[PDB]
Design a protein around this ligand. Structure first.
Ligand SMILES: Nc1ncnc2[nH]cnc12
Length: 294
């Protein structure tokens, strides 16, 4: 089938640019477990030209992986080989030869944006609205880049953004990302694996994913940022989202949120995907709020 073809092709592809000697990689503590796989802290000796050890993160399959999970890891590898942006997690290499598939990626010392925000508060860690706006802007910059590359991320959420040295955002978790060069849309007959509460109305009902459904997810992400890692649609069961969204309901303006910021969220969640802003516009709106605050 499609996966068996991918695995065979992968196992023969002589890939000197990305292949890394397993013996030069030492794995450490678990940093997290996504639904497709797990990430562990690691160190790699003589990685891509750097003398000595470099601390990295390593993505691998969980125990008892399914074909779905294996497909997603292979896909993430294939996507990450083609992307290069300061706000997208960087790929360093892979170990594929004499053991389980390991992807070697950039380590982000602060962990997920969600965890970073929830440990904070607005003025443990002290964040200003300026900082919050900055975070969103960096993510929007990254997304503009991916959208230009005709990639749809599909799984944008604070748990999928990492925070690197200098509080720099890194979009991560490309296992569900898909190329839309030919049709500008990705459509799947089967039920998706993205959490319901982050999905655009047309993804939930019609299984259509585009850059403008990424924009909807960004609006949920914006809400998570503004609420310092709140839970979307709190107390509302996911099965209720079909009716709630189709009848035009959206999350209300949260506390410590300007009318301008809330307006941007609502715009991300317009029923009609064509009425939603593009990432370029999102970046311009955020930069504007940043300078108006000074
Ligand atoms: N690449 C990564 N770097 C740091 N912490 C992480 N948690 C999950 N993935 C991570």
């Amino acid at each position: 089938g499609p996966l068996s073809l991918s695995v065979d092709a992968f196992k023969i592809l002589e890939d000197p640019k990305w292949e890394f000697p397993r013996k030069n990689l030492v794995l450490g503590k678990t940093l997290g477990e996504g639904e497709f796989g797990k990430v562990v802290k690691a160190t790699a000796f003589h990685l891509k030209g750097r003398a000595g050890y470099t601390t990295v993160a390593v993505k691998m399959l969980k125990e008892n992986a399914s074909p779905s999970e294996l497909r997603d890891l292979l896909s993430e590898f294939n996507v990450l080989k083609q992307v290069n942006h300061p706000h997208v997690i960087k790929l360093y290499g892979a170990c594929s030869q004499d053991g389980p598939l390991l992807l070697i990626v950039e380590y982000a010392k602060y962990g997920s944006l969600r965890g970073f925000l929830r440990e904070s508060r607005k003025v443990e860690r002290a964040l200003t609205m300026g900082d919050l706006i900055s975070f969103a802007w960096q993510i929007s910059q990254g997304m503009q880049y991916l959208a230009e590359m005709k990639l749809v991320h599909r799984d944008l959420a604070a748990r999928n953004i990492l925070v690197a040295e200098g509080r720099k955002m890194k979009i991560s978790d490309f296992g569900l990302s898909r190329d839309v060069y030919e049709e500008d849309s990705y459509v799947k007959r089967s039920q998706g694996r993205i959490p319901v509460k982050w999905m655009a109305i047309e993804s939930l009902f019609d299984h259509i994913y585009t850059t403008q459904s990424d924009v909807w997810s960004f609006g949920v992400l914006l809400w998570e940022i503004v609420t310092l890692g709140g839970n979307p649609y709190p107390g509302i069961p996911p099965e209720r989202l079909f009716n709630l969204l189709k009848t035009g309901h959206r999350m209300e303006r949260p506390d410590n949120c300007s009318e301008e910021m809330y307006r941007l969220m609502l715009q991300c969640w317009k029923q009609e995907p064509d009425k939603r802003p593009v990432f370029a516009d999102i970046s311009k709106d955020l930069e504007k709020m940043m300078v108006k605050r000074r």
